[PDB]
Design a protein around this motif. Structure first.
Motif, PDB file in Angstrom:
ATOM      1  N   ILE A 133      42.628   4.995 -20.610  1.00 21.56           N
ATOM      2  CA  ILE A 133      43.824   4.896 -21.449  1.00 21.56           C
ATOM      3  C   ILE A 133      45.052   5.434 -20.695  1.00 21.56           C
ATOM      4  O   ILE A 133      46.168   4.949 -20.896  1.00 21.56           O
ATOM      5  CB  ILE A 133      43.601   5.616 -22.786  1.00 21.56           C
ATOM      6  CG1 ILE A 133      44.742   5.414 -23.765  1.00 21.56           C
ATOM      7  CG2 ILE A 133      43.430   7.128 -22.605  1.00 21.56           C
ATOM      8  CD1 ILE A 133      44.803   4.041 -24.327  1.00 21.56           C
ATOM      9  N   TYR A 173      46.954  14.405 -24.135  1.00 19.44           N
ATOM     10  CA  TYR A 173      45.686  14.407 -24.872  1.00 19.44           C
ATOM     11  C   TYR A 173      44.502  14.006 -24.032  1.00 19.44           C
ATOM     12  O   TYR A 173      43.433  14.595 -24.122  1.00 19.44           O
ATOM     13  CB  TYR A 173      45.779  13.484 -26.091  1.00 19.44           C
ATOM     14  CG  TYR A 173      44.517  13.512 -26.915  1.00 19.44           C
ATOM     15  CD1 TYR A 173      44.207  14.624 -27.696  1.00 19.44           C
ATOM     16  CD2 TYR A 173      43.585  12.493 -26.810  1.00 19.44           C
ATOM     17  CE1 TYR A 173      42.996  14.716 -28.358  1.00 19.44           C
ATOM     18  CE2 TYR A 173      42.364  12.593 -27.498  1.00 19.44           C
ATOM     19  CZ  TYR A 173      42.099  13.715 -28.245  1.00 19.44           C
ATOM     20  OH  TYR A 173      40.828  13.722 -28.788  1.00 19.44           O
ATOM     21  N   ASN A 174      44.652  12.944 -23.247  1.00 17.15           N
ATOM     22  CA  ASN A 174      43.526  12.321 -22.557  1.00 17.15           C
ATOM     23  C   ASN A 174      43.335  12.908 -21.149  1.00 17.15           C
ATOM     24  O   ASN A 174      44.250  13.431 -20.556  1.00 17.15           O
ATOM     25  CB  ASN A 174      43.754  10.810 -22.476  1.00 17.15           C
ATOM     26  CG  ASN A 174      43.847  10.183 -23.858  1.00 17.15           C
ATOM     27  OD1 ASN A 174      42.843  10.023 -24.558  1.00 17.15           O
ATOM     28  ND2 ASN A 174      45.052   9.848 -24.264  1.00 17.15           N
ATOM     29  N   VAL A 197      48.101   6.373 -33.430  1.00 10.96           N
ATOM     30  CA  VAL A 197      46.720   6.707 -33.142  1.00 10.96           C
ATOM     31  C   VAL A 197      45.966   6.958 -34.440  1.00 10.96           C
ATOM     32  O   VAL A 197      46.346   7.816 -35.246  1.00 10.96           O
ATOM     33  CB  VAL A 197      46.636   7.912 -32.198  1.00 10.96           C
ATOM     34  CG1 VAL A 197      45.218   8.428 -32.055  1.00 10.96           C
ATOM     35  CG2 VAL A 197      47.209   7.543 -30.842  1.00 10.96           C
ATOM     36  N   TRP A 253      47.953  -2.856 -26.441  1.00  8.57           N
ATOM     37  CA  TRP A 253      47.283  -2.720 -27.728  1.00  8.57           C
ATOM     38  C   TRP A 253      47.006  -1.277 -28.203  1.00  8.57           C
ATOM     39  O   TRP A 253      47.152  -1.051 -29.395  1.00  8.57           O
ATOM     40  CB  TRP A 253      46.055  -3.618 -27.817  1.00  8.57           C
ATOM     41  CG  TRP A 253      44.975  -3.253 -26.846  1.00  8.57           C
ATOM     42  CD1 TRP A 253      44.771  -3.781 -25.584  1.00  8.57           C
ATOM     43  CD2 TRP A 253      43.964  -2.256 -27.005  1.00  8.57           C
ATOM     44  NE1 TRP A 253      43.747  -3.148 -24.959  1.00  8.57           N
ATOM     45  CE2 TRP A 253      43.224  -2.209 -25.814  1.00  8.57           C
ATOM     46  CE3 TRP A 253      43.633  -1.374 -28.040  1.00  8.57           C
ATOM     47  CZ2 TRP A 253      42.189  -1.327 -25.650  1.00  8.57           C
ATOM     48  CZ3 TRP A 253      42.639  -0.494 -27.837  1.00  8.57           C
ATOM     49  CH2 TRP A 253      41.898  -0.458 -26.676  1.00  8.57           C
ATOM     50  N   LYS A 309      32.386   8.256 -27.253  1.00 11.04           N
ATOM     51  CA  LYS A 309      31.349   8.900 -28.120  1.00 11.04           C
ATOM     52  C   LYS A 309      29.954   8.604 -27.668  1.00 11.04           C
ATOM     53  O   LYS A 309      29.087   9.474 -27.731  1.00 11.04           O
ATOM     54  CB  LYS A 309      31.501   8.350 -29.554  1.00 11.04           C
ATOM     55  CG  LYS A 309      30.551   9.004 -30.561  1.00 11.04           C
ATOM     56  CD  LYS A 309      30.781   8.399 -31.943  1.00 11.04           C
ATOM     57  CE  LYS A 309      29.906   9.052 -33.014  1.00 11.04           C
ATOM     58  NZ  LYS A 309      30.615  10.124 -33.711  1.00 11.04           N
ATOM     59  N   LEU A 318      38.954   6.584 -34.363  1.00 11.11           N
ATOM     60  CA  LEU A 318      38.663   6.907 -32.947  1.00 11.11           C
ATOM     61  C   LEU A 318      37.826   8.159 -32.767  1.00 11.11           C
ATOM     62  O   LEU A 318      37.507   8.524 -31.649  1.00 11.11           O
ATOM     63  CB  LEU A 318      39.943   6.951 -32.156  1.00 11.11           C
ATOM     64  CG  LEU A 318      40.659   5.605 -31.957  1.00 11.11           C
ATOM     65  CD1 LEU A 318      41.968   5.770 -31.214  1.00 11.11           C
ATOM     66  CD2 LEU A 318      39.776   4.577 -31.290  1.00 11.11           C
ATOM     67  N   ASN A 319      37.499   8.821 -33.874  1.00 14.36           N
ATOM     68  CA  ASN A 319      36.718  10.068 -33.827  1.00 14.36           C
ATOM     69  C   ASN A 319      37.380  11.100 -32.908  1.00 14.36           C
ATOM     70  O   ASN A 319      36.762  11.663 -32.002  1.00 14.36           O
ATOM     71  CB  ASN A 319      35.250   9.795 -33.451  1.00 14.36           C
ATOM     72  CG  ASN A 319      34.491   9.015 -34.520  1.00 14.36           C
ATOM     73  OD1 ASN A 319      34.370   9.467 -35.652  1.00 14.36           O
ATOM     74  ND2 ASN A 319      33.947   7.864 -34.149  1.00 14.36           N
ATOM     75  N   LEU A 320      38.636  11.376 -33.209  1.00 14.91           N
ATOM     76  CA  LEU A 320      39.438  12.345 -32.476  1.00 14.91           C
ATOM     77  C   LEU A 320      39.931  13.439 -33.432  1.00 14.91           C
ATOM     78  O   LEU A 320      41.114  13.510 -33.763  1.00 14.91           O
ATOM     79  CB  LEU A 320      40.638  11.676 -31.804  1.00 14.91           C
ATOM     80  CG  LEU A 320      40.395  10.395 -31.034  1.00 14.91           C
ATOM     81  CD1 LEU A 320      41.737   9.828 -30.587  1.00 14.91           C
ATOM     82  CD2 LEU A 320      39.473  10.642 -29.849  1.00 14.91           C
ATOM     83  N   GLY A 347      36.440  12.254 -26.945  1.00 15.86           N
ATOM     84  CA  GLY A 347      37.493  11.479 -26.276  1.00 15.86           C
ATOM     85  C   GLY A 347      37.522  10.038 -26.701  1.00 15.86           C
ATOM     86  O   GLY A 347      36.588   9.541 -27.369  1.00 15.86           O
ATOM     87  N   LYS A 348      38.593   9.343 -26.309  1.00 17.53           N
ATOM     88  CA  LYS A 348      38.725   7.984 -26.755  1.00 17.53           C
ATOM     89  C   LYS A 348      37.660   7.100 -26.151  1.00 17.53           C
ATOM     90  O   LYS A 348      37.471   7.029 -24.930  1.00 17.53           O
ATOM     91  CB  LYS A 348      40.067   7.395 -26.414  1.00 17.53           C
ATOM     92  CG  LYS A 348      41.202   7.976 -27.211  1.00 17.53           C
ATOM     93  CD  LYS A 348      42.477   7.208 -26.906  1.00 17.53           C
ATOM     94  CE  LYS A 348      43.573   7.741 -27.752  1.00 17.53           C
ATOM     95  NZ  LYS A 348      44.748   6.844 -27.720  1.00 17.53           N
ATOM     96  N   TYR A 349      36.926   6.417 -27.014  1.00 14.99           N
ATOM     97  CA  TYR A 349      35.988   5.340 -26.625  1.00 14.99           C
ATOM     98  C   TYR A 349      34.842   5.905 -25.827  1.00 14.99           C
ATOM     99  O   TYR A 349      34.156   5.133 -25.140  1.00 14.99           O
ATOM    100  CB  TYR A 349      36.672   4.221 -25.840  1.00 14.99           C
ATOM    101  CG  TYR A 349      37.885   3.763 -26.610  1.00 14.99           C
ATOM    102  CD1 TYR A 349      37.753   3.259 -27.936  1.00 14.99           C
ATOM    103  CD2 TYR A 349      39.147   3.805 -26.075  1.00 14.99           C
ATOM    104  CE1 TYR A 349      38.871   2.821 -28.643  1.00 14.99           C
ATOM    105  CE2 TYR A 349      40.254   3.393 -26.786  1.00 14.99           C
ATOM    106  CZ  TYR A 349      40.117   2.891 -28.034  1.00 14.99           C
ATOM    107  OH  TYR A 349      41.267   2.522 -28.670  1.00 14.99           O
TER     108      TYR A 349
END
Lengths: 127, 11
Positions: free
Chosen positions: A105, A98-99, A46, A40, B7, A51-53, B3-5
């Protein structure tokens, strides 16, 4: 914040083709990855806004996702299998760039990449 | 934190 336009899925200036390898990439590889429980996050570009990125598209200048790949395959956008394989590798590598290495993820991407590699190991001879 | 998820994560 704004997202960039998504990667193109058709281009009248780009020659199109079908090969048995591209068919395999659609019917075997994409199909396997798309149904996975971890697909998903990768089924669409993205969404850096939701996602506040705010830095995502500052870091990732070659975005790619399986929704784009799926449309490209359905549209016969690719000339050859290598182009499509590169899009999958870009997708995975973007996630790792990125992560943070331990992030959930990243573990999801790794599971999908393992499956990807297992399937592309049996990419048929072109014919 | 960024970062993802993440916050709403703070420790």
């Amino acid at each position: 914040s704004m997202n960039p336009p998504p990667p193109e899925t058709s281009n009248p200036n780009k020659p199109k083709r079908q090969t048995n390898q591209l068919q395999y990439l659609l019917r075997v590889v994409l199909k396997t990855l798309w149904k996975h429980q971890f697909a998903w996050p990768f089924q669409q570009p993205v969404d850096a806004v939701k996602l506040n990125l705010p830095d995502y598209y500052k870091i990732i200048k070659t975005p790619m996702d399986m929704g784009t790949i799926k449309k490209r395959l359905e549209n016969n956008y690719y000339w050859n299998a290598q182009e499509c394989i590169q899009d999958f590798n870009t997708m995975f590598t973007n996630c790792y760039i990125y992560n943070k290495p331990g992030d959930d993820i990243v573990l999801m991407a790794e599971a999908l990449e393992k499956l990807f590699l297992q399937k592309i190991n049996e990419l048929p001879t072109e014919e | 934190v960024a970062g993802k998820y993440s916050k709403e994560f703070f420790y």
